[PDB]
Amino acid sequence: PLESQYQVGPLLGSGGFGSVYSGIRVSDNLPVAIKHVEKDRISDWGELPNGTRVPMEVVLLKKVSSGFSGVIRLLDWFERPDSFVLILERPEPVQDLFDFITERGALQEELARSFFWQVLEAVRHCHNCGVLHRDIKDENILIDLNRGELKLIDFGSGALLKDTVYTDFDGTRVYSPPEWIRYHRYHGRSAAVWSLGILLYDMVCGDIPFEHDEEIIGGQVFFRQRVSSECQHLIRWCLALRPSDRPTFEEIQNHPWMQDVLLPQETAEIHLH
Amino acid sequence: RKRRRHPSG
Ligand SMILES: Cc1nc(C2CC2)nc2sc(C(=O)O)c(C)c12
């Protein structure tokens, strides 16, 4: 019974991911997000343990679910005649990182450092669990404004992580790497690092660097805001044109710009409260 | 200049 376990609230958003409603779990008043995905729009399917056929997004969410709060938690799911319904946790109060950057403009590097670090830990967790998100962007990052904790959301473009080449992609093009633009080929980790460089530029400059294919492949990073030389170096390294020239996640988190990160609670008290 | 969201796909 789906309509009896959850009280449904207003629409939160709709788009390529489906339609997402605010909700509350009746048993304990837990805030949830209720995501509807039409069966005809699901590209990749998977099988659970019991071999029940579910969208791959359900498989990936189950693989990353745990106590670690940096990724969205799938609480339950249901199958309907023409759709699947996913019950996801909902931070409250919350703002996504796209709206946050729109309202605040370019972020102080201390705050960008804290946010970027948490995103790296969340993406490391995905990869540790065998999951490639493929749509890292500010729109897909929720800020818990009380706790200062970030959550990676919308695994609808994701895939099982593999070490061979990917030749399909349905994430966000302005965060996709030049090898995808040029050759329709990418490898998972180095493509994720590219999207992280786009994200870090977005945080410290107030918008993404590239809008057009020619800029993505062009190899020039112009800084529209004052950014420290250390931060610029890390961004330009993540945005190396050759995938093998990009840093690993270890090299990103050992980068000099990344040291002395704020704790999440400190981040909320200094920058969010 | 115009900052905007970008849909997936
Ligand atoms: C549109 C949306 N709004 C929100 C509001 C912050 C509650 N949460 C999610 S979680 C999600 C997903 O696919 O995991 C999506 C697409 C949303």
Side-chain angles (χ1 to χ4, degrees), chain A residues 1 4-6 8-42 44-46 49 51 54-61 63-72 74-273, chain B residues 1 3-9:
Chain A
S4 69
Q5 291 194 61
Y6 300 96
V8 184
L11 187 70
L12 294 167
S14 69
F17 49 83
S19 302
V20 175
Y21 295 79
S22 184
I24 283 162
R25 182 164 66 190
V26 168
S27 67
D28 62 341
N29 289 332
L30 185 75
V32 300
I34 303 175
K35 183 181 181 173
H36 301 258
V37 179
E38 286 172 350
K39 281 178 175 177
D40 297 332
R41 301 193 58 250
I42 291 154
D44 303 318
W45 295 81
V54 295
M56 187 56 51
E57 174 176 5
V58 172
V59 169
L60 304 179
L61 283 171
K63 283 172 68 60
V64 299
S65 59
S66 80
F68 170 70
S69 73
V71 299
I72 199 84
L74 181 68
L75 303 169
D76 204 14
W77 62 269
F78 310 83
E79 176 175 9
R80 280 174 162 187
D82 302 283
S83 63
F84 282 83
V85 182
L86 312 197
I87 311 296
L88 304 160
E89 72 184 334
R90 173 169 60 89
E92 168 60 39
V94 71
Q95 187 179 44
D96 72 42
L97 181 55
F98 178 92
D99 288 337
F100 185 88
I101 290 168
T102 298
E103 294 183 0
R104 293 242 187 152
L107 308 183
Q108 303 178 8
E109 283 183 35
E110 174 183 85
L111 176 57
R113 171 183 302 112
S114 174
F115 282 2
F116 195 60
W117 184 269
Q118 290 192 42
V119 176
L120 293 160
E121 294 281 317
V123 174
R124 287 183 56 202
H125 172 75
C126 294
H127 292 193
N128 293 342
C129 298
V131 171
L132 186 72
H133 184 279
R134 299 202 290 187
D135 199 17
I136 300 163
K137 58 176 176 173
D138 55 4
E139 297 183 67
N140 286 340
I141 295 166
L142 298 182
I143 307 165
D144 185 321
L145 297 166
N146 282 350
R147 301 181 51 80
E149 296 170 352
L150 272 51
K151 285 199 180 303
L152 183 60
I153 65 168
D154 195 356
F155 283 70
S157 309
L160 298 174
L161 178 67
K162 69 189 179 180
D163 297 314
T164 50
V165 69
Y166 294 85
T167 58
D168 68 295
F169 174 78
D170 278 286
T172 301
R173 192 177 177 87
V174 288
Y175 284 76
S176 74
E179 60 271 23
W180 167 250
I181 307 290
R182 278 193 176 272
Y183 315 116
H184 275 199
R185 294 169 62 85
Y186 60 97
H187 286 78
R189 302 166 176 91
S190 56
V193 166
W194 175 278
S195 67
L196 289 164
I198 303 294
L199 179 66
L200 177 53
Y201 185 101
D202 181 47
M203 285 185 299
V204 298
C205 286
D207 201 6
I208 61 184
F210 312 135
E211 290 290 343
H212 308 286
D213 289 359
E214 295 67 23
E215 294 160 342
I216 295 171
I217 67 175
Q220 283 302 137
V221 182
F222 165 90
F223 279 88
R224 56 193 79 191
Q225 186 90 1
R226 197 280 168 177
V227 177
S228 72
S229 298
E230 295 80 357
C231 184
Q232 288 197 10
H233 175 269
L234 176 57
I235 291 171
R236 289 199 171 95
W237 194 11
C238 293
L239 298 181
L241 284 183
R242 168 61 174 107
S244 66
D245 284 339
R246 296 176 200 145
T248 63
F249 286 74
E250 180 176 26
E251 287 175 310
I252 295 173
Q253 292 190 291
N254 286 331
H255 192 279
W257 185 76
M258 295 253 60
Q259 309 307 302
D260 293 308
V261 66
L262 293 175
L263 308 178
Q265 183 58 26
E266 293 168 342
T267 300
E269 293 173 351
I270 295 170
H271 294 283
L272 308 181
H273 291 171
Chain B
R1 68 190 61 84
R3 167 170 167 85
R4 67 183 192 83
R5 292 175 178 262
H6 302 84
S8 307

PDB file of all heavy atoms in Angstrom, chain A residues 24-30:
ATOM      1  N   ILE A  24       5.607  12.941   3.396  1.00  0.00           N
ATOM      2  CA  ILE A  24       5.878  12.659   4.799  1.00  0.00           C
ATOM      3  C   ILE A  24       5.436  11.232   5.076  1.00  0.00           C
ATOM      4  O   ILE A  24       4.301  10.862   4.761  1.00  0.00           O
ATOM      5  CB  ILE A  24       5.160  13.657   5.728  1.00  0.00           C
ATOM      6  CG1 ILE A  24       5.910  14.994   5.748  1.00  0.00           C
ATOM      7  CG2 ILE A  24       5.031  13.090   7.127  1.00  0.00           C
ATOM      8  CD1 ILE A  24       5.090  16.152   6.270  1.00  0.00           C
ATOM      9  N   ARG A  25       6.342  10.423   5.626  1.00  0.00           N
ATOM     10  CA  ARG A  25       6.010   9.048   5.985  1.00  0.00           C
ATOM     11  C   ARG A  25       5.090   9.047   7.200  1.00  0.00           C
ATOM     12  O   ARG A  25       5.446   9.587   8.252  1.00  0.00           O
ATOM     13  CB  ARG A  25       7.276   8.243   6.266  1.00  0.00           C
ATOM     14  CG  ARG A  25       7.006   6.777   6.603  1.00  0.00           C
ATOM     15  CD  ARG A  25       8.271   5.931   6.496  1.00  0.00           C
ATOM     16  NE  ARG A  25       9.275   6.284   7.499  1.00  0.00           N
ATOM     17  CZ  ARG A  25      10.527   5.833   7.494  1.00  0.00           C
ATOM     18  NH1 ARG A  25      10.942   5.017   6.531  1.00  0.00           N
ATOM     19  NH2 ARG A  25      11.370   6.209   8.446  1.00  0.00           N
ATOM     20  N   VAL A  26       3.915   8.432   7.055  1.00  0.00           N
ATOM     21  CA  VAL A  26       2.857   8.575   8.054  1.00  0.00           C
ATOM     22  C   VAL A  26       3.287   8.001   9.400  1.00  0.00           C
ATOM     23  O   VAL A  26       2.945   8.545  10.459  1.00  0.00           O
ATOM     24  CB  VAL A  26       1.560   7.921   7.543  1.00  0.00           C
ATOM     25  CG1 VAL A  26       0.539   7.801   8.658  1.00  0.00           C
ATOM     26  CG2 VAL A  26       0.986   8.731   6.395  1.00  0.00           C
ATOM     27  N   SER A  27       4.061   6.914   9.386  1.00  0.00           N
ATOM     28  CA  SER A  27       4.352   6.194  10.624  1.00  0.00           C
ATOM     29  C   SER A  27       5.121   7.063  11.616  1.00  0.00           C
ATOM     30  O   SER A  27       4.778   7.116  12.802  1.00  0.00           O
ATOM     31  CB  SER A  27       5.123   4.910  10.316  1.00  0.00           C
ATOM     32  OG  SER A  27       6.418   5.193   9.820  1.00  0.00           O
ATOM     33  N   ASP A  28       6.160   7.765  11.149  1.00  0.00           N
ATOM     34  CA  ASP A  28       7.025   8.535  12.036  1.00  0.00           C
ATOM     35  C   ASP A  28       7.223   9.986  11.600  1.00  0.00           C
ATOM     36  O   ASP A  28       8.133  10.650  12.112  1.00  0.00           O
ATOM     37  CB  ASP A  28       8.391   7.850  12.165  1.00  0.00           C
ATOM     38  CG  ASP A  28       9.123   7.767  10.843  1.00  0.00           C
ATOM     39  OD1 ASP A  28       8.460   7.903   9.792  1.00  0.00           O
ATOM     40  OD2 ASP A  28      10.356   7.566  10.851  1.00  0.00           O
ATOM     41  N   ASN A  29       6.408  10.492  10.671  1.00  0.00           N
ATOM     42  CA  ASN A  29       6.479  11.870  10.180  1.00  0.00           C
ATOM     43  C   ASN A  29       7.806  12.195   9.497  1.00  0.00           C
ATOM     44  O   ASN A  29       8.189  13.366   9.408  1.00  0.00           O
ATOM     45  CB  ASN A  29       6.216  12.880  11.302  1.00  0.00           C
ATOM     46  CG  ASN A  29       4.774  12.884  11.750  1.00  0.00           C
ATOM     47  OD1 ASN A  29       3.870  12.566  10.976  1.00  0.00           O
ATOM     48  ND2 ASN A  29       4.547  13.250  13.006  1.00  0.00           N
ATOM     49  N   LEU A  30       8.519  11.198   8.997  1.00  0.00           N
ATOM     50  CA  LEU A  30       9.809  11.463   8.369  1.00  0.00           C
ATOM     51  C   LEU A  30       9.603  12.188   7.041  1.00  0.00           C
ATOM     52  O   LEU A  30       8.785  11.753   6.224  1.00  0.00           O
ATOM     53  CB  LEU A  30      10.571  10.162   8.145  1.00  0.00           C
ATOM     54  CG  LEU A  30      11.984  10.375   7.612  1.00  0.00           C
ATOM     55  CD1 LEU A  30      12.896  10.875   8.720  1.00  0.00           C
ATOM     56  CD2 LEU A  30      12.532   9.106   6.972  1.00  0.00           C
TER      57      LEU A  30
END
